[PDB]
Structures are given as structure tokens and as C-alpha cells.
């Protein structure tokens, strides 16, 4: 191969791998923040559905 070909192919390799490494670091930071705060879509552990609640007038009023 030409030195030009090896050179610019190396530059394409380095761009792809440095982008993947920066995305992995951001992935770790996103996971840490979402586990710590619970405000993203990950680590959304379930709670009770409020659509199960009966809101009808019951037998006794103090409720």
C-alpha cells in the first residue's frame, strides 16, 4: 500500500476509536448520574400504578 493510504486509513481508525472511547467515558458518567439521582430513563424501578385506586364514594366518608 501507499504511505498515503496507510496514513489516512490510520487517521480514520484513530477517529473512530477515539469517538468510541469518549462515548464509553460519557456512558459511565451517564450511568453514575442516573443511578445517583433516579431522574433519567435508566434505573427506573417500579412503584404502584395509581390507576388501581378506587375513587368512588366509599361506605364511610372519612377517607
Amino acid at each position: 500500500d501507499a504511505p498515503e493510504k496507510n496514513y489516512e486509513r490510520t487517521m480514520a481508525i484513530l477517529q473512530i476509536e477515539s469517538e468510541k472511547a469518549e462515548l464509553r467515558l460519557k456512558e459511565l458518567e451517564v450511568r453514575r448520574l442516573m443511578r445517583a439521582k433516579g431522574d433519567g430513563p435508566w434505573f427506573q424501578y417500579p412503584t404502584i400504578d395509581k390507576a388501581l385506586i378506587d375513587h368512588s364514594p366509599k361506605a364511610t366518608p372519612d377517607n
Binding site: 473512530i16 468510541k20 462515548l23 431522574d39 427506573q44
Partner: protein, 57 residues
């Protein structure tokens, strides 16, 4: 002149005209927490694949 109610009448659900206001918060509840932000936007492919150590897809 009072007429005794028939079978079924005293168990009816009646309507009541009042002058007191309807309670806006009968449970004395505070404000609910704001929900988590939803998903929006188109779903793009994963940038350079799985990014699992050496797999290019």
C-alpha cells in the same frame, strides 16, 4: 298527608342543591412531584455499534 316511600325510593341517589363551595383539596394534599422527562425524537442507530471492547457492530 305523608306517604310512606315505596320499595326502592329511599335507596335512590338524589341530587342536592347547596350554597357551600366545593372543596378544591379535600385530602389536604401538597403538590405532586414533577415526573421524569419523557422520550422524544427519532431513534438513531448506535454510534459505531455496541462499543463493546472491539466489536465494530
Amino acid at each position: 298527608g305523608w306517604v310512606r316511600p315505596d320499595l326502592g325510593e329511599l335507596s335512590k341517589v338524589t341530587k342536592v342543591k347547596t350554597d357551600r363551595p366545593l372543596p378544591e383539596n379535600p385530602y389536604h394534599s401538597r403538590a405532586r412531584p414533577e415526573p421524569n422527562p419523557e422520550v422524544e425524537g427519532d431513534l438513531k442507530p448506535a454510534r459505531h455499534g455496541s462499543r463493546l471492547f472491539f466489536w465494530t457492530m
